[PDB]
Design a binder for these strands. Structure first.
Ligand SMILES: [Zn+2]
Lengths: 64, 100, 54, 195
RNA sequence: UCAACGCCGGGAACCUCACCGGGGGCGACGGCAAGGCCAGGCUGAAGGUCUUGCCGGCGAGAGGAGGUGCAUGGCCGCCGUCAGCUCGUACUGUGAGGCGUCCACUUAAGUGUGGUAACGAGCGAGACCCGCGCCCCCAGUUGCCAGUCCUCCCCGCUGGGGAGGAGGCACUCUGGGGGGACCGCCGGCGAUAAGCCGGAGGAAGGAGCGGGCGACGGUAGGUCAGUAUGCCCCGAAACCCCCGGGCUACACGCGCGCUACAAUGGGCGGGACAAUGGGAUCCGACCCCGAAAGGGGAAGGGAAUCCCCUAAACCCGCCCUCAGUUCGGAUCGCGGGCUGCAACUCGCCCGCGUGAAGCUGGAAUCCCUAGUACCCGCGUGUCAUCAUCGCGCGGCGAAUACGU
């Protein structure tokens, strides 16, 4: 199942709450920003967080 | 005449410790050193049954003891021997020296 | 006159290998000089350094 | 061979550890560290009450230094006794203390609540105690007390949690005591801190 | 019953042993000499007890492979790698209790998205740990040999092909660190969400693949014959040590397997090609004996250096041509060997003979979705000797469905 965990989604939303412009619509840029901002030593967790942030940026820039 | 040193251990951090110690020992002075060279890791495997009785489906525990192995050659100079043999080895590492 | 209570010096057979901990006779792992039973080894393995690693 | 000597020394170490855990059950036995040296093999014995070991008499230390060589075959061995700090975070010392309390005749619910309070007061995130046996009547039962956070299963379980087991030999059977503690400087993988 | 029946790691010659037939030993501590030996008797054999002499100066208790797994602990199987078990405040109920934990969609998942007298937390799931697969950096021996150089050998046609040594580490391999995959991009579905189905490039796609860790509880599930342990019991013994037997006895019923009923083959002679693991009175190359099993010397190896180790199925040619057979091997006779103190009861191997059922199998029932199943053979555990077994390793390699 490709279901994002509650803490993944929550940390993504919390990092989009502030630092709202450090992120963009590029998975690699979001990877870099995540690794710079938070202390996560799991590539999979970090990549899932970055993907969720990407989807959030898309949803925001398009509206809802 | 050259000296070979073999390191064996279960912990990799102690191995890296001793190897980097001797690496600095050999870089301070100008001496030719090869390695450290990694040898194949050796595993003692033991499979056994869990239940102390005969009833019930059979289930097995597989235990393993791993041993990592490094090799080093030091060129066997007097200063090198002097300032190498004086390194406290962590008890979780075995080290054996000998000249070719 | 006092020797009818002592065993014989076996070199081979199941009566030549007791466990260093319990005293069982039959099942001895006997790998790499381990004179332990399959019941005590499974309990003292971590103390010796074995792990699962599967 | 190298590995044969390795494993045999390990096994003898385990045997000596068991013997000492059985003999020094009062002082509070925490662990052992044997170091061989040309200076002379030495045995570091951890304890929370070195009085029961070397208190106003060296009879015990002499007897131990003689037994370690007459029974387990240790060459020119000496013994150093060391004190343990943070005994309220070791799950073996506490298990044995709880067992001795039960043996004294003190009620098990009261004793367990007291131990939980004492372990919570001196720094910890989680404690679980399980008692089993003939607590009340002829039929056996199990009882469980808990407080805080724990990690029952997984690699962080197998690593960051301290565990202990003990037997209480009472007038009418055996009671099993199992204790598990989590230290205060432990952090689980699923907790991530933000800048 | 699943969840007993190649299970108790249970492949038992002695030991193991707990069974049978015999023999001999065992009383710390408390109170009112012990012992030991040449010769010959008794004896299966025994200074075990006797002839001969001579040296020497009653409670209670240990132990118990004895009883109770329905007095316990500890550890294991099955509900179940199922998705469940709870708490704080508030609210509805006189109350036991309820709600949250419900509805719709979704997910491997009490996994999530929306709606809701509920709002928020915890243990379990996931995260976590190991290995496989693609790439980069470091390292170059005991691992590798491509291009370079210098010798030696041989063929056909001077074109080629081999073996060493110098010397390299390039390729392979080994092992430390690091990157890489995230439904991320483009479409349709779902509702605009949570998500689902397809294309792209890619080593690898949709928790990449395969494993370990298995929750609150409950089963009077199994184990006191792995160790620990209450109660009862034997304590001259049910304690523990030898010597011989048995667990291997066989009109029969059953489970799990091996070999077969032949041509999708049997035999003879030639030609190929692995991986995992292990190794001190251990592995043993190499040489010589012997038809074979095996025997005598003996290098090297404490194992990236030496050894176990040129695996079988497979390919080529010849004989057999549908037959109880050149199919099949049971059973039995004679002889030769190895281990062991001891091979009759009761061990394994070799040669020449002998040549039993078996012609594809009723009712019924079992395992399997990818390098998986079928087929083929090796390692290791048990081991002095003994594998139709367990745990693992590789070789060759499918058919169907993407459902209910
Ligand atoms: Zn044992």
């Amino acid at each position: 199942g490709n279901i994002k965990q509650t803490f993944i989604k929550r940390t993504a939303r919390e990092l989009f709450d502030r630092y709202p412009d450090k992120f963009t619509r590029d998975f690699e840029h979001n990877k870099k920003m995540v690794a710079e901002l938070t202390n996560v030593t799991s590539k999979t967790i970090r990549n899932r967080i970055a993907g969720y942030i990407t989807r959030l940026v898309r949803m925001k820039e398009e509206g809802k | 005449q050259k000296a070979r040193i073999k390191l064996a251990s279960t912990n990799i951090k102690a191995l890296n410790e001793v190897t980097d110690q001797i690496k600095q020992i050999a870089e301070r002075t100008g001496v030719r050193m090869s390695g450290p060279i990694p040898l194949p890791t050796k595993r003692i495997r033991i499979t056994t049954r869990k239940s102390p009785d005969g009833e019930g489906s059979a289930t097995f525990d597989r235990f393993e003891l791993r041993v990592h192995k490094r090799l080093v050659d030091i060129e066997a100079d007097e200063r090198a021997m002097r300032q190498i043999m004086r390194i406290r080895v962590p008890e979780d590492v075995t080290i054996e020296i000998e000249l070719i | 006159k006092a020797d009818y209570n002592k065993r014989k010096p076996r070199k081979f057979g199941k009566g030549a290998r007791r466990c260093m901990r319990c005293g069982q006779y039959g099942p001895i792992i006997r790998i790499h000089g381990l004179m332990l039973c399959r019941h005590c080894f499974r309990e003292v393995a971590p103390k010796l350094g074995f792990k699962k690693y599967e | 061979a190298i590995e044969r000597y390795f494993i045999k020394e390990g096994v003898k170490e385990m045997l000596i550890d068991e013997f000492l855990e059985k003999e020094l059950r009062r002082a509070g036995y925490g662990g052992l560290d044997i170091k061989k040296t040309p200076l002379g093999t030495k045995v570091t014995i951890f304890a929370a009450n070195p009085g029961y070991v070397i208190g106003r008499g060296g009879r015990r230390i002499r007897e131990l230094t003689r037994i370690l060589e007459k029974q387990f075959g240790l060459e020119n061995p000496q013994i150093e006794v060391e004190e343990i700090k943070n005994p309220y975070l070791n799950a073996k010392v506490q298990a044995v203390r709880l067992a001795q309390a039960l043996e004294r005749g003190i009620h098990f619910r009261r004793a367990a609540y007291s131990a939980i309070r004492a372990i919570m007061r001196n720094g910890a995130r989680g404690v679980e105690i399980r008692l089993s046996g003939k607590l009340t009547g002829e039929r056996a039962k199990s009882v469980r007390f808990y407080q805080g956070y724990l990690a029952k299963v997984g690699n962080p379980a197998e690593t960051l949690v301290s565990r202990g087991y003990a037997q209480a030999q009472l007038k009418l059977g055996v009671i099993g005591v199992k204790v598990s503690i989590m230290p205060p400087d432990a952090k689980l993988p699923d907790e991530i801190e933000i800048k």
